[PDB]
Amino acid sequence: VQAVAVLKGDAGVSGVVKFEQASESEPTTVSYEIAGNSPNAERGFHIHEFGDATNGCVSAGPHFNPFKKTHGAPTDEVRHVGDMGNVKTDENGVAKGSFKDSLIKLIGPTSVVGRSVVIHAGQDDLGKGDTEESLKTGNAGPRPACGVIGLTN
Amino acid sequence: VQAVAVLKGDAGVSGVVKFEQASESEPTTVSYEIAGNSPNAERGFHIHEFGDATNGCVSAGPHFNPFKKTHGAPTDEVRHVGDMGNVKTDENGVAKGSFKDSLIKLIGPTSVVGRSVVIHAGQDDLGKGDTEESLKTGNAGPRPACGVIGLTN
Amino acid sequence: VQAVAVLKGDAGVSGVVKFEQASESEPTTVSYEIAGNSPNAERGFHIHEFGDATNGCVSAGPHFNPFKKTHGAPTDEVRHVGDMGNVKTDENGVAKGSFKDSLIKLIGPTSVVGRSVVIHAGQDDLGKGDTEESLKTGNAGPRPACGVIGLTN
Amino acid sequence: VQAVAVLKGDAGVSGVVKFEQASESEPTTVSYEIAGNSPNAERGFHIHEFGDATNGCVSAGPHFNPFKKTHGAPTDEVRHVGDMGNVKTDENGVAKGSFKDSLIKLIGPTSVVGRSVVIHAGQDDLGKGDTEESLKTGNAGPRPACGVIGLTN
Ligand SMILES: [Cu+2]
Ligand SMILES: [Cu+2]
Ligand SMILES: [Cu+2]
Ligand SMILES: [Cu+2]
Ligand SMILES: [Zn+2]
Ligand SMILES: [Zn+2]
Ligand SMILES: [Zn+2]
Ligand SMILES: [Zn+2]
Structure with a gap:
């Protein structure tokens, strides 16, 4: 009911x-602070299915998609539960913020506890790209950092 | 359900x-392979309450203990659910094994998902000792590596 | 803001x-009179999740627990909202009383309106058992009578 | 968001x-299967005010009418929100079907959750009789069965 994911990786x-x-x-409140990103950018921020890091961020699977839908924007009606959009980084490569979400949960059958949060190397096209992958991953590219979602105090 | 924990720290x-x-x-089967430990020894292996990694292994808290009991051996009646006793390390410092446990669950109100696994620097006295501390932690010592328990497959 | 549940079953x-x-x-005032129980006993009394009677009392589901807690006593910090403890039966099998509760509400997001009240065949251990079942239902047993909570006056 | 009422009483x-x-x-979808009616007939189908089954169906009170209108058909402008008109029974006295309604809701201040569904013994005159009662209950007569609308999943 309070959970945390410490993001780590090998790309700084x-x-x-x-x-x-x-x-x-009730909705979940998401609050993040991630550094070491590109400055002045927009980077993909998502919940991947598995809290598995056997081989790093690549071990986390695809997006959490209990309802079998297509990739979208946090604001779209048609999105994966793990779709948190893009985070905007500052002049120093720092992304900081907070938001509320109605799909993402800590409680019940669709809980994300035990799953992974990923920060991508690229930007999420919210599924409005003209490529077929857009509807899967939004083309956010690779996975510089990820972390298992754990229960906290 | 299949869950996994990747064990890391700064002590190799x-x-x-x-x-x-x-x-x-049904019973949970636990399997592991852990490296970097002292050779020919015994080291404490437990499930701690928090899947909190904001402060290394420290922030994992105490032993998961929903039944409010004292520390013991995995084969004792009185024990924490998290108590997995000691792993035996070989001539190369490797710990490899498997076991079935009936308290440890992946499903249910006592689920360990989102919690942490702890590999200690010392031997768990199995609550059979000198102190009061034995009754809390089995005097296992510091925590050189830990991991949040995540869902996989 | 006044509600009622008529408890019926196939068990008398x-x-x-x-x-x-x-x-x-404000706290919710609970008043009751239940007959046909065992005499001079303690039987479990709870609010279950669903107001679904398609399958007797079975279809009411588990205990109402919007806050994701373990089964406890009405007076403990950790408990389901629907945990109302045990009612005491007299020489005639009648259970009559009232009590005030601050977790149970008729107004708001966690309202019990439309949910079910269940009276059990056994005694609630209050979550003070050593099993996971204690933590789920207090080991109160079967469900002889239940009823949907409806609006009235 | 999803709910059910199980219709019972003492008349088959x-x-x-x-x-x-x-x-x-959004509008509400209503689907039903009712048995034990007279065959090839039309019977009044309404949501009554109280989910009170204390004394049986006579305890449900009058029609749900938060907007203080006069009784009518589901398709008129002036109707109680609880007016579902008549259900048509087949040769074996079974009424089955589905509809969509805009007055009836599951969510908000006029929610029907915790109120009663009633199936009458006679045909609803839809408010077009000359009598007074017509404007009240559409002269649908007694209540063979009713049930409280409860939450389900
Ligand atoms: Cu992603
Ligand atoms: Cu430990
Ligand atoms: Cu119960
Ligand atoms: Cu009516
Ligand atoms: Zn996605
Ligand atoms: Zn212990
Ligand atoms: Zn309970
Ligand atoms: Zn009416």
Whole structure:
């Protein structure tokens, strides 16, 4: 009901993601601070299916998609539950923010506890690219950092 | 359900812990391979409460103990759910094995998903000792590597 | 803001439970009279998740737990919202009383309106058992009578 | 967002009515299967005010009418939100079907969750009789069965 993912990797990317959700029907509050990114950029931020890091961020699987839909924007009606959009980085490569979400949960059958958060190397096209991958991953590219979502105090 | 924990730290000890539990009622099988430990020895191996890695292995908290009991051996009646006793290390400092446990679950209110696995620097006295501390941690010592338990497959 | 549940089943147990709440912040007053129980006993009394009677009391599901907690006693910090403890039966098998509760609400997101009240065949251990079942239902046993919580006056 | 009422009483009439509403603005879908009616007939089908089964169906109160209108057909402008008109029974006295309604909701201040569904013993005159009662209940007579609308999943 309070969870955290410490992001780590081998590309200088690093950070912490905080989840808060008080009750089953309430929205989760996502708060992140990630550094080591490109400056002045937009980078893909998502929930991948597996909290598996056997071989690094590549071990995490595809996007969390309990409802079998297509990749989209956090604001679209048609998205994967793990679709958190893009995070915007500053002049120093720091992405900092917070938001609320109704699809992402800590409680119940679709819980994300035990899953992974990924920060991509590229930008998420929200599925409005003209490529077929756009509808899978949004073409956000590789995985500089990821972290398992764990239960905290 | 299949869960896994990738064990890391800054002391050169590392490894993989796999969990498997078919159904609620059923026992969880745990399998592991851990490297970098002292040779020919015994080291404490537990499940700690938090899957919090904001402060290395420290932030993992104490032993997961929903039944509010004291520390013991995996084969004791009185024990924490997290108590997996000691792993035996070989001539190369490797710990390799498997076991089935009935308290440790992947499904249910006592689920270990989102929690942490801990590989200690010392031997777990199995709550059979000198102190009061024995009754808390089995005096296993510091924590050279840990990992959040995540869902995989 | 006044609700009621008529408890019926195939076991000879029946009764009526009343709930009254004037504002979301105020505590909910629970009043009841239930007959046909064992005499001079303690039987489990809970709010289950669904107001679904398609399959007797079975279809009411588990305990109402929007906050993702373990089964406990009405007076513990950690408990399901629907944990109302045990009711005491007299010489005639009648259970009659009232109590105030601050987790149970008729107003808001965690309202119990439309959910089910279940009276059990056994005694609630209060989560003070050593099994996972204790942590799920207090080992209260079968469900002889239940009823949907409806609006009234 | 999903709910059900299980129709029962003492006259052989029984059944299930399902409701589904995705959001407050969307219309509600109603589906039903009712048995034990007279065959080849039309019977009044309404949502009554109280989900109170204390004394049986007579305890449900009058029609749900938060907007203080006069009784009518589901298609008129002036109707109680609880007016579902008549259900047509077949040769074996089974009424089956589905509809969509814009007054009836599962979400918000006029939610029907916790109120009663009633199947009458006679035909609803839809408010077009000359009598007074017509404007109240459409002269649908007694209540062979009713059930509280409860939450389901
Ligand atoms: Cu991604
Ligand atoms: Cu330990
Ligand atoms: Cu119960
Ligand atoms: Cu009516
Ligand atoms: Zn996606
Ligand atoms: Zn222990
Ligand atoms: Zn409970
Ligand atoms: Zn009417």
